Design a protein around this ligand. Structure first.
Ligand SMILES: [Cl-]
Ligand code: NA
Ligand code: NA
Ligand code: NA
Lengths: 129, 210
């Protein structure tokens, strides 16, 4: 499914991402915009055999198991398939571990290059939370 | 004979960090000052990649990081060699860059995009054709998204003067965009074949594009 912008803000708010490890809600929406354009089913296969999954494009080298990334770990201990649901629960819970891995939201290049140091509250503007 | 060969390989893992690099070297050129210039740059790039891996294994942990680089010969004709080098960095999500070099085998020339055309009008002409291609693609396939007319993302306006490009075996020009460059990350590395009928009269000649 493809979330509307405000619809995703409202949903990420429920899941406690507003100001989680310090990051205001706009950052998590902005991140999703530039990973997946709000598409929960987005998938991207890369040169190394890994795949990015879901609305936050979590990658199988580190964070989930898809059985086809030789030599990878599964730190969020989930099948990668769980990151492709229309319910965002599983992707939020893995994202929460990822931001705690030691680098903040910097572990997402999309955030670094399109979101960081911008006016990220704008991804919330016009919404009714 | 002009061909790419593997010349250094680094696979190594430690703490929360890994690296898996295969680096190419160019051999066979009659012009060795070019062949060494080319090969020197491939090695500085590898060296940089190892540095970033060593830096992530040093001092305080800064999160999980995977670094990967490989390479592929995409065009190998009697007249032309073109080599893709990929540089992939993975923490939360994967980030792929793809760079190319394209060599005129008969004259020992490293081609630039600029050298293919009589003047700078190619920038706007190619940029425009790409916008049209993106538009048509989006129209045909609602799973394809480019930052074109999206009101919330900075749109793609122009290629760079030295934009990544290569030349195919059938003598077509291809422009390549890294991930996140013109589109959300799920779209991957995107590329565009520029039809020759669109740019033919801007070409210096038909040695390379036809
Ligand atoms: Cl696996
Ligand atoms: Na995995
Ligand atoms: Na990605
Ligand atoms: Na490039």
């Amino acid at each position: 499914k493809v979330f509307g912008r405000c619809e995703l803000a409202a949903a990420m708010k429920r899941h406690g991402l507003d100001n989680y490890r310090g990051y205001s809600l706009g950052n998590w929406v902005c991140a999703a915009k530039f990973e997946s354009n709000f598409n929960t089913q987005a998938t991207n296969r890369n040169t190394d055999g890994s795949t990015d999954y879901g609305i936050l494009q979590i990658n199988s080298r580190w964070w989930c198991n898809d059985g086809r990334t030789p030599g990878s770990r599964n730190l969020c201990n989930i099948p990668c398939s769980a990151l492709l649901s229309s319910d965002i629960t599983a992707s939020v819970n893995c994202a929460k571990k990822i931001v705690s891995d030691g680098n903040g939201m910097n572990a997402w290049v999309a955030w670094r290059n399109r979101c960081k140091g911008t006016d990220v509250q704008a991804w919330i503007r016009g919404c009714r939370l | 004979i002009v061909k790419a060969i593997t010349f250094i390989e680094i696979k190594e893992e430690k703490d929360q960090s890994s690296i898996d690099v295969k680096t190419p070297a160019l051999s066979g050129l009659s012009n060795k000052e070019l062949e060494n210039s080319i090969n020197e740059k491939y090695l500085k790039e590898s060296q940089q990649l190892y540095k970033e891996f060593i830096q992530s294994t040093s001092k305080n942990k800064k999160g999980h990081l995977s670094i990967y680089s490989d390479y592929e010969t995409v065009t190998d004709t009697p007249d032309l060699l073109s080599i893709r080098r990929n540089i992939e960095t993975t923490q939360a999500s994967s980030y792929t860059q793809s760079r190319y070099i394209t060599i005129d085998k008969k004259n020992d020339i490293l081609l630039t995009l600029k050298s293919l055309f009589k003047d700078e009008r190619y920038i706007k002409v190619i940029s425009q054709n790409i916008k049209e291609q993106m538009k048509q693609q989006m129209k045909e396939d609602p799973n394809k998204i480019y930052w074109l007319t999206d009101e919330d993302a900075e749109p793609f306006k122009t290629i760079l003067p030295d934009q990544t490009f290569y030349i195919t075996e059938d003598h077509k020009l291809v422009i390549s965009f890294d991930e996140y460059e013109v589109a959300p990350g799920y779209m991957g590395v995107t590329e565009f074949t520029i039809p020759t009928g669109v740019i033919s009269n801007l070409l210096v000649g038909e040695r390379y594009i036809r």
